[PDB]
C-alpha cells in the first residue's frame, strides 16, 4: 500500500554471488506519448505498490560496483531506449550511412527500477559512507532497486541520488589516474538550462547555477579530496582535450542535444570577487553528434521552436586526475565521463545480485 514493508531475518538462508537477467519496472503511463513512457510500458512491468526490504542482521557481504553485471544490463536497455526513440536522420556507423526517420519527440526521463526474477535476490549496502567496494556491515535484501532515471550525460551527473551522509569519492583504483572518479554529493545544486524562444541563433542556449550554493559544494568536494591525497592543494582545470561530448557538459534536454562549457564551474579563486552570484555557462545545441551508444556519428533534426528548459539537480561529478605530478604539492582534476556505464554505476553501486538455494 504505502511504499515499503521492512523485515528482519537471522542465520538463514544460504546464497552465493551470481549473474542473471534482470527485468525493469516503472510507473510509465501507457497513454503518454513521451518516449521513455512508450518504451517502459512495453519494456518494464508495472511497479509493485508493496515493495519489501529485509535487513539481514549481523551479516557482512562484500560489494564491488566496478564489476556489477546490473550495470551492463541497464546499458543494454538504455541503448534500446535510444535506438527506439531518438532515431537519427543520418547515422554513420558500421561502414554505412543509415537513413531513417527522425521525427521530433516528447522526451523526458522517468525512473526505472531493476528487479530480480524468481530464485534470485538483490542485496543492498546501507553503510552510509560506502565508497563502492569491499565490506558492507548494514546489509539488506530488496525486490528491486530504487527509481533510476536513465539520464545520459557527461561531467555532471544529473537527477540522480545523493550521498546520505558525507560526500563520497568512488574509483576502481584511486591511485590510478587513468581510472575515472565519481563524486557522490550530499547536497544537490540546480543547473537551469535554457534555449530561449527569440522569434536569430536557435542554437545559442545557456545554463544558470547559483554560484553561491555551488562554490560551497565544490570547496567541500575539494576538502573531501584533500583526505584521499594527504591534505595536498586540490586544483581544478578544464578538460585538456578530446571530443566536445567530454570537453563539454553534454546531455539531452527535451530531445535536443546540449553542449555546455564548464570552465566557469571549476574556478579555484572562488575556493571573493564575483563568484557569489550567478554562474552562466555558454551552451550550444548540436545536430551532428558522436554517439554514446556505439561508435559513429549521427545527425538529428534542427531544434524545436519555443522555450526549451530543463532544471536538473546536480547529484554527482565525474572527474579524472592528472598524474605524473606525484611529485608536486598539488593534484589536478578535470571534468570527465564519456563511459555511460559510469552513470549507471553512480546509482547501482549499492546493489548486487545473488542466487538463493
Amino acid at each position, epitope marked *: 500500500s*504505502d511504499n515499503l*514493508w*521492512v523485515t*528482519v531475518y*537471522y542465520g*538463514v538462508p544460504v546464497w552465493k554471488d551470481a549473474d542473471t537477467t534482470l527485468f525493469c519496472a516503472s510507473d510509465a503511463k501507457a497513454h503518454e506519448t513521451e518516449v521513455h513512457n512508450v518504451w517502459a510500458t512495453h519494456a518494464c512491468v508495472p511497479t509493485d505498490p508493496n515493495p519489501q526490504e*529485509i535487513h539481514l542482521e549481523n551479516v557482512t557481504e562484500n560489494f564491488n560496483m566496478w564489476k556489477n553485471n546490473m550495470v551492463e544490463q541497464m546499458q543494454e536497455d538504455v541503448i534500446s531506449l535510444w535506438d527506439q526513440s531518438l532515431q537519427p536522420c543520418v547515422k554513420l556507423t558500421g561502414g554505412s550511412v543509415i537513413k531513417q526517420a527522425c521525427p521530433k519527440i516528447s522526451f523526458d526521463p522517468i525512473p526505472i527500477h531493476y528487479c530480480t526474477p524468481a530464485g534470485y535476490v538483490i542485496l543492498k549496502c546501507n553503510d552510509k559512507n560506502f565508497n563502492g567496494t569491499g565490506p558492507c556491515k548494514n546489509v539488506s535484501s*530488496v*525486490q528491486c532497486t530504487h527509481g533510476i532515471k536513465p539520464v545520459v550525460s557527461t561531467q555532471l551527473l544529473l537527477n540522480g541520488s545523493l550521498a546520505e551522509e558525507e560526500i563520497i569519492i568512488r574509483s576502481e583504483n584511486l591511485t590510478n589516474n587513468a581510472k575515472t572518479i565519481i563524486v557522490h554529493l550530499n547536497k544537490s545544486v540546480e543547473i537551469n538550462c535554457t534555449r530561449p524562444s527569440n522569434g536569430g541563433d536557435i542554437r545559442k542556449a545557456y545554463c544558470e547555477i547559483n554560484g553561491t550554493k555551488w562554490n560551497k559544494v565544490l570547496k567541500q568536494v575539494t576538502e573531501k579530496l584533500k583526505e584521499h591525497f594527504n591534505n595536498k592543494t586540490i586544483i581544478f582545470q578544464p578538460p585538456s582535450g578530446g571530443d566536445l561530448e567530454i570537453t563539454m557538459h553534454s546531455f539531452n534536454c527535451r530531445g535536443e542535444f546540449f553542449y555546455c562549457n564548464t570552465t566557469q564551474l571549476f574556478n579555484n579563486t572562488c575556493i571573493m570577487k564575483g563568484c557569489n552570484g550567478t554562474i552562466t555557462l555558454p551552451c550550444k545545441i548540436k545536430q551532428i553528434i558522436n554517439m554514446w551508444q556505439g561508435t559513429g556519428q549521427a545527425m538529428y533534426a534542427p531544434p524545436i521552436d519555443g522555450k526549451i528548459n530543463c532544471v536538473s539537480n546536480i547529484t554527482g561529478i565525474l572527474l579524472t586526475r592528472d598524474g605524473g605530478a606525484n611529485n608536486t604539492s598539488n593534484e589536478t582534476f578535470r571534468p570527465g565521463g564519456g563511459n555511460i556505464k559510469d552513470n549507471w554505476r553512480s546509482e547501482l553501486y549499492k546493489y548486487k545480485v545473488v542466487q*538463493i538455494e
Partner: antibody
Amino acid sequence: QVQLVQSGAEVKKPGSSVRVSCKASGGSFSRYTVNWVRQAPGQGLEWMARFIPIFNMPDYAPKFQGRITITADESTSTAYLELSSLTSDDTAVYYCASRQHHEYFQEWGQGTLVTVSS
Amino acid sequence: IVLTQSPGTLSMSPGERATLSCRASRTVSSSNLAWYQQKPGQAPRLLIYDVSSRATGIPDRFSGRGSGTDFTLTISRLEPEDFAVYYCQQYGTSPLTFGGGTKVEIKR
C-alpha cells in the same frame, strides 16, 4: 475496517496437534500479514511465528522450531497455525495479529483458547 | 534478544504521571519498538509504534520514547480505564520478543 476472527476454542490431549484458523476481512491480506502470538493463563505475551517476505519462508521462535507450521490461503483470506506434540503448558489463548509496515501488530483476533490436557 | 519491564507492579492513583520503561538485553536496533495495553479478559491493543508514533484511535495521555536500549512508556495523567497491563515488543532484531509486562494497579 480490517478485522480478524479465529476458530473456536479447542481441547487437545498431550502429544497431539492443534490447528487454529484466522480469517481476515475488509483490508489487505497476503501471507505476510498474520503473525501468531500466544498467552498462557495470566502469564505474559509470547510471540511465535511470522512469514518472511522475499525468501519467503516461515520464521518461528526457537521454543517451537520443530513443532510448528504456519500457512496462508490467499483466496480464502485465511491464516493457519499448526502446533504439534502438545504439552500441558501449551494451554494458552492463541492470537492472530496483523503485521503492518514495520512488524508491530495493529489488528488482533478475538483469541482462541487451546486447552491441552488429558 | 531479551527485554524486561521493571517493575512487575506499578501502584499509582489516577492523574499521577510517573512512568515505566522497557529495557533490552543486547540492544534492539533502529527506533523499532512498540507497546500494547492489555486489560483483563481482552486481547492486546496497539498503543505506540516505531517508538513514539501513536496508533490511529488513541487519544493522547499515552506518550512514549527511547532509542538505544531504554524506551520509556510515558504515563502523565491516568484514567479509570487506563489501569491495565502494559506489554512491549521490539521488531528490530532476531526473533520477535515481548516483555513480561507491567501492571498498573490503582493505589488507595
